[PDB]
Amino acid sequence: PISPIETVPVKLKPGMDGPKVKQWPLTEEKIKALVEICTEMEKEGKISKIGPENPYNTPVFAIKKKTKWRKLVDFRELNKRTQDFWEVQLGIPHPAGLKKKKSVTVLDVGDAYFSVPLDEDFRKYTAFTIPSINNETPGIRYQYNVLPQGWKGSPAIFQSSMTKILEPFRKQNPDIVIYQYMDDLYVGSDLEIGQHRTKIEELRQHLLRWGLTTPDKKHQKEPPFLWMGYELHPDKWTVQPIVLPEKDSWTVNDIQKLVGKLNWASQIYPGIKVRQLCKLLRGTKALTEVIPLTEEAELELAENREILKEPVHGVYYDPSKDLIAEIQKQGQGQWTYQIYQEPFKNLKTGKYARMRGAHTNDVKQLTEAVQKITTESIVIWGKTPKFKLPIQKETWETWWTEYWQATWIPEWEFVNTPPLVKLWYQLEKEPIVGAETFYVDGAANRETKLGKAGYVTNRGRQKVVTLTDTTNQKTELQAIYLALQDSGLEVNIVTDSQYALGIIQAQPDQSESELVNQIIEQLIKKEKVYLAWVPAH
Amino acid sequence: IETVPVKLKPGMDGPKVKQWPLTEEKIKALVEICTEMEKEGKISKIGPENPYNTPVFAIKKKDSTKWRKLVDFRELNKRTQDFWGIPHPAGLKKKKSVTVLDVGDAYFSVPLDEDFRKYTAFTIPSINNETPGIRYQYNVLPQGWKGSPAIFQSSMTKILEPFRKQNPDIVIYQYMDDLYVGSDLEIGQHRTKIEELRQHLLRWGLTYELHPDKWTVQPIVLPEKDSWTVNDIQKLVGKLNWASQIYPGIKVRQLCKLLRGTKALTEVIPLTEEAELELAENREILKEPVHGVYYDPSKDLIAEIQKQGQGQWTYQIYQEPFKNLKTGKYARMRGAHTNDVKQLTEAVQKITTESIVIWGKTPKFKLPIQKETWETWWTEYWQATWIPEWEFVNTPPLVKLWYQLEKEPIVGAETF
């Protein structure tokens, strides 16, 4: 059960050398075990008894499972002195992108790691030693002939080998999809179950051909398949049940795990909340610190248990059908979406953590949500979804058409499902005839942080205020704030504030400054505003 | 023939760039194209012991639906030893008209040194990662690699010479996978000659209408009004002010005088004879580009773009701040009316080609777009074998305001 498979040319890193760390000592009880285990592999062909010619070595240990003694070789060192390979698939498939299959059979190619050969030129760096009863005469020397478990190259190499082998079958059976993942091969089809079964057996046999020994009936996996928090059934997918333990004492860790698992849930279940629980982490002094849950928290944690009792289910990808994506602004910065082909039958749902920045607007954020989604779709369905967005086209056209930055939204359609996104305000194109005119200004000693800010209008109104512990931007921005307060529904404000210039261009509706936020609230409350920038001094 | 040994710059290792996500139809094409190349032996599958990797993608060839493979060796090119190619024909940019030819197929029949091949590794993605990437590697000279056109210089001058010599008046300049040809001949006379040469290139196995003569660098045109308002002056003064970073003889002095006090933003102000002249001097200064600006090969080329909205975009090609080598405007192409990205990328290429045409090197772009927005969609509208470097930036408000003044034609180029 070894293999007549080509080996891959493996080299070490840039001029380094095979590991040479001494063998951790063991008891007679642990030695006997390894010798046992080793003697079997020695014959199974996995390893070969060597000699002193090998200057390299690696630590082998003994750990029993749930009570037979199993062995463990520590390759950390080698792995360090091992060249690099091309990442062995770090991007795994998402259920929302699988097609439903009349059948899906899973073949186990477990020990396969120990079934494929190693680069005959490399096998020396894998050499390890089975000690003798407490540092007596030297022990038994071995070295791996097959891909060693826990070794850097093993995952990459295994998957490559398994690919060459599946090349033919796949080329010969187009109507069949196989998914290579570690020790598994999920093979699915739409052939009649008898046909399916027959083919499977054909595959198994072809494998048996290359020494990839056949599994057992006991170890056979069956639907529903558990995958990244999901339960994959033949006709649909569901969520692996998620339970919030009931406790009388909650530590910081417990509140963080809870928040952790809860957050991941906000992605599939609608209504999840963690705000009140998240307050529980303020001033926490130690992971094990016991934090008493507030009424708001106990209530929150309560509703959640109930939401999680919901049987959210989903559907699989049907290439014949449209890909629709509908988004909702669940709040400033927060967004939700659901990719579906036919109404109410979702492929995938999702939410995006309150995107908080230095200064943007909803439309801009809307756009970002859209792109993250499009990138997501491209990977999952190799195509972009038609978008149903809660924003009129006039709003979009108005925004995008003049915004200083390049932006875009693929084909999309409007859907009146409040709340809709809109432009809270629009600085006037030209100064306002009739409206008052404020000539604002703010000054502060960058060092004494003592400053003042005010304005003078073409109409006589004038104010000034002293501010302690302030910066120049603030004063200026404050200059603008008052102007906005002390003014009517139509104002003309002029300033030599460099920031007010960025505001004129971006016209944000949210930012890192409560102060700027204040200005915005006022900006929004206004009927007509004309911001003007003029050089300072 | 034989393979000339190529090597990376001392200390550089092969590129290991991730493969960005590809659309289904795009992956389909590359799989065809690639199995074809495999058969034809230009490339052959590779193992995991090859850790390098360059991104690949698919574009559309003009007039046809047939897809074209495009690999982004920007990273590999960068780390590739230098072969110090052809100097720049200062006369190219002068010719009345220029045409570009896609001669990247030429290299396909030239072996690549075996030791370098690893560095050309590239992967073909798969929807939802349901299939491991299809890893290949080049055997022949790859399209898009700087090393290619280089190694194929002798073999090119050779096949070109009998035409260059035959037609000493026409200019032929080669860049990356492209060939830039430009004659002064009449349109008819020009195009046919191209075909003539074409058949010539056709004689071995190989198959845009530019006009550098009109690539004038436009001037800044200041406003002009019957009566002027506080605002109008306030605006103007800020622009001139900023602009004095270029033309120092520019003055706002007097204008700032009649701007003292606190009156309605809309109130009309009388222009003092001093402000009048100050403004007139300013117009005279802006009548031409700033003196003393010369291209310096030892320095990178920079191209910045500002979005003027409504489909209009301004750009500046410079190497030193305010010391532009060229400036300009760009209006979108009939069929990009709802796609910002498209216009931007359509422009990048135009500007790059011009850069090539004029200096024989692509400039470094400063794009007024968000990383994610660009990286997600430019490949959708890319149509050149080469790819220019770029960075994403935030357009300073004023910079936009200034160049927004770029002098525009009376009616423009009249195509009767």
Ligand SMILES: CCOCn1c(SC2CCCCC2)c(C(C)C)c(=O)[nH]c1=O
């Ligand atoms: C029993 C259903 O198994 C889920 N499933 C599946 S199996 C699924 C199992 C978890 C890892 C990803 C693949 C497949 C293929 C890959 C066999 C498919 O095409 N379509 C599916 O619906």
